[PDB]
Amino acid sequence: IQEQTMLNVADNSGARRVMCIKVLGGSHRRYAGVGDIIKITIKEAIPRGKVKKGDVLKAVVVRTKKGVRRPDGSVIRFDGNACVLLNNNSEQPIGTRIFGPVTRELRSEKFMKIISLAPEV
Amino acid sequence: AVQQNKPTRSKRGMRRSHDALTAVTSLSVDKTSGEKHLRHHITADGYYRGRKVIAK
């Protein structure tokens, strides 16, 4: 979310704990956590995941403890901070299957595949 | 911090121009005893408006 933020991975190919090295989009953007794309290092990885430790690639935040605010004032708060790993050049999901809840805020462009694969929207 | 040159007695008076006390300009007179008191205050013999409010 912020820089120096550890996140869980929703998708399978992305592995375990990941850290946000940069908040992409914006000159001095401090905090971005709803549908935003963040540059990611892999701080710890299982070997079954395709990506490995020390590798930089993009991600999109899917779950935030801060939570989205709906238009009527509703706040959906998800426990845990989660990301879906994306390729640096393509920004397309590496993982074949997305796990856990997703929000309807991730309905734009390449995130349609994420909400298609993920069970609960 | 410290002054670089000594201020004049003129500057002292100009600063003390606003340190002038204000008089009362009106002392209220009670009806049942014509002694003067501060307005909205007891008469120092024990009366407010027409009645003996405090015995002391």
């Binding site: - | 205050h41 007891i42 120092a44 405090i54 015995a55």
Partner: protein, 120 residues
């Protein structure tokens, strides 16, 4: 800032404020007229007058609440037996403040706070 806020700190902590208002309310119930500085009298209205509004209804739980505040059983007994019937028809304003002269030791605006239907 202090916006739409009530209560006067009176340059003391909250424990000292509650202790002074308990002792002060007990003194006002016992003597029925006391001399105190004017801000303290204005804040005293808000601790003495709820006790009399409690004391208009006489019950075991109400006696316990008026004991938990002010912690003095003689003040509880006076509040429920003597006052209460003294103020039952009266709808508020049991305490009345009369501004008096300035204190000699320090120039404090002083006042007399008294129960309204005091005999003398």
């Amino acid at each position: 800032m202090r916006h739409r806020k009530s209560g006067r700190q009176l340059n003391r902590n909250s424990s000292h404020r509650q202790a002074m208002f308990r002792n002060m309310a007990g003194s006002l119930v016992r003597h029925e007229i006391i001399k105190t500085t004017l801000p303290k009298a204005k804040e005293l209205r808000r601790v003495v007058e709820p006790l009399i509004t409690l004391a208009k209804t006489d019950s075991v739980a109400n006696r316990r609440l008026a004991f938990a505040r002010t912690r003095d059983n003689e003040i509880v007994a006076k509040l429920f037996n003597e006052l209460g019937p003294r103020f039952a028809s009266r709808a508020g304003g049991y305490t009345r403040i009369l501004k008096c002269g300035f204190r000699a030791g320090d120039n404090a605006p002083m006042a007399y706070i008294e129960l309204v239907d005091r005999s003398e």
